[PDB]
Amino acid sequence: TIGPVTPLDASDFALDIRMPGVTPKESDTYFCMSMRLPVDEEAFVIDFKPRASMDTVAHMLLFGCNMPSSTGSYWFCDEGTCTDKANILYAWARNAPPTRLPKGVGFRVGGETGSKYFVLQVHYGDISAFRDNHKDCSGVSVHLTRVPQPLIAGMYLMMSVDTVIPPGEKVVNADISCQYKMYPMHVFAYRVHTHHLGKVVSGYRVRNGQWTLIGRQNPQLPQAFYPVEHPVDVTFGDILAARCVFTGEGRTEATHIGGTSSDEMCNLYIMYYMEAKYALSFMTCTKNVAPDMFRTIPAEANIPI
Ligand SMILES: [Cu+2]
Ligand SMILES: [Cu+2]
Ligand code: NI
């Protein structure tokens, strides 16, 4: 080994979270493994270094989850592994170099209310190179500290629950909105998720009837975290709003929200930071509290990228 925990700086350490020498049989194999945080006190994730085999690795995801495993182990996993409401800490996709965390920012783990386990999912797409039966140890090295950080990263997940897409309908809009009523968050990156019917997903902060884009992306592109130009402050009274556009073309019956590939999802993951003393690591919106606000949604919410 050397070990999974290594020192760095004065009072920091690194957790190498790798696959334990896997060799996948079929292509488009999803493997998971997990590791425990080696301290029980409050600590902060302040960086991620991808250690991926450009050969065969399509994507990696790191979740703050709560799935203990034996130190050798790995297993077949799918999208729902850490639920509905998965706390993604890091995504990596081939051909979408991800973005660093902003200076002073880290994810708050351990303690009485943080994650004690990290779960890593690695997608092996093209398995040409396992012709030869070598073991792959792809993954992420995570820079941890016990030194309090002034800014705390979190995730605001917007998702639709009761959308229905009729067969052959060229356009169905799944709309999501909630008023924001916390201390200020600063949005710096976003990720979108639909299945194959999704055409475009967009999210906005609306303040005083004025729409500010957070992000807009094709969900059929690599589902990584994309940066936000300038961060968007969201603040008490603001409304977060999102629209996924679906088509029914090429379907025979209606499509509902669900986990399988013949079902659909509309998820927008908004990654933010907050000042340490007011911070929440996770918020959720599953409602549409301001449906009529969508009269003024920019037209490009309905235009595929
Ligand atoms: Cu993938
Ligand atoms: Cu899904
Ligand atoms: Ni600025």
Author numbering: 50 to 354
Text lifted from the article:
Two enzymes, peptidylglycine α-hydroxylating monooxygenase (PHM; EC 1.14.17.3) and peptidyl-α-hydroxyglycine α-amidating lyase (PAL; EC 4.3.2.5) working sequentially are the only proteins known to catalyze this reaction. PHM, a two Cu enzyme, catalyzes the stereospecific hydroxylation of the glycine Cα of peptidylglycine substrates. The two copper atoms in PHM, CuH, and CuM (located in the N- and C-subdomains, respectively), each use a single reducing equivalent from ascorbate to catalyze the reduction of molecular oxygen for the hydroxylation of the Cα of glycine at the carboxy-terminus of the peptide substrate. Crystallographic data on apo wild-type PHM and on several crystal forms of three CuH mutants (H107A, H108A, and H172A) presented here show that the copper ions are required not only for the catalytic steps but also for substrate binding and for locking the overall conformation of PHM in a configuration that is catalytically active.
Inclusion of 1–3 mM citrate, which produced crystals (H107A-PHM-cit) that diffracted to higher resolution, had unexpected effects on the structure of H107A-PHM and provided information about alternative conformations that can be adopted by this mutant. H107A-PHM-cit has two molecules in the asymmetric unit. Interestingly, the copper sites of these two molecules (A and D) present in the same unit cell have very different configurations, probably because citrate is only present in one of the molecules (molecule D). In molecule A, copper binds at the CuH site despite the absence of His 107 by retaining the coordination with His 108 and His 172 and adding two water molecules as ligands. Even though molecule A does not have a bound citrate, it shows a change in the conformation of the loop containing residues 126 to 130 that brings Glu 128 into the proximity of the CuM site. Molecule D, in contrast, has no copper at the CuH site and contains a bound citrate that bridges the two remaining histidines of the copperless CuH site to the CuM site. Citrate binds close to the empty site of CuH and interacts directly with H108 and H172; the carboxylate of the citrate partially occupies the space that in wild-type PHM forms the peptide binding site. Loss of coordination by H107 allows the CuH site to adopt a tetrahedral coordination by the inclusion of two water molecules, implying that square planar geometry at the H site is destabilized relative to the tetrahedral alternative. This observation strengthens the case for a functional requirement for a non-reactive open coordination site in CuH that allows electron transfer but prevents binding of small molecules that could modify the electrochemical potential of the copper.
